[PDB]
Curated annotation (Swiss-Prot):
Modified how: Phosphorylated on serine residues.
Annotated protein name in UniProt: Na(+)/H(+) exchange regulatory cofactor NHE-RF1
Disease: Nephrolithiasis/osteoporosis, hypophosphatemic, 2: A disease characterized by decreased renal phosphate absorption, renal phosphate wasting, hypophosphatemia, hyperphosphaturia, hypercalciuria, nephrolithiasis and osteoporosis.
Domain PDZ, chain residue ranges per copy: 11-91
Mutagenesis or variant effect for residue 107 to V: In NPHLOP2; likely benign; the mutant expressed in cultured renal cells increases the generation of cyclic AMP (cAMP) by parathyroid hormone (PTH) and inhibits phosphate transport
Subcellular location: Cytoplasm; Apical cell membrane; Endomembrane system; Cell projection, Filopodium
Tissue: Detected in liver, kidney, pancreas, prostate, spleen, small intestine and placenta, in particular in the syncytiotrophoblast.
Superkingdom to which the source organism belongs: Eukaryota
Lineage, highest ranks first: Eukaryota, Metazoa, Chordata, Craniata, Vertebrata
Described function: Scaffold protein that connects plasma membrane proteins with members of the ezrin/moesin/radixin family and thereby helps to link them to the actin cytoskeleton and to regulate their surface expression. Necessary for recycling of internalized ADRB2. Was first known to play a role in the regulation of the activity and subcellular location of SLC9A3. Necessary for cAMP-mediated phosphorylation and inhibition of SLC9A3. May enhance Wnt signaling. May participate in HTR4 targeting to microvilli. Involved in the regulation of phosphate reabsorption in the renal proximal tubules.
Inducers of expression: By estrogen.
Residue numbers bearing the Phosphoserine modification: 43
Coiled-coil ranges per UniProt: none
Amino acid sequence: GIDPFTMLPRLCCLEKGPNGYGFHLHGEKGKLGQYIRLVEPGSPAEKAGLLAGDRLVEVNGENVEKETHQQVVSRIRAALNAVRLLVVDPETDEQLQKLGVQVREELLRAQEAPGQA
């Protein structure tokens, strides 16, 4: 039997503290997405569940799957006191996308009957 879903994306809501959010975001050359480069131990970023390796899929509520470092930062600026980061394990993202499911948010919703229904 095949598992339709596995280790799905997570919208991580973290708050801006004395050191910002305590995470370093970078866009890998060759690729067209943003990834968690570093999580500063003791930051609210850890509390939200950010791990160095997760792919940034969405920011606050704006899709940044294919968006550039500058484009995401601009969306990050729209965070008043706290930012919502939608992230998923990079290997899983590609396989789940092959299933045609919108990893950005619809996946988190459609945990009830896999799909838009």
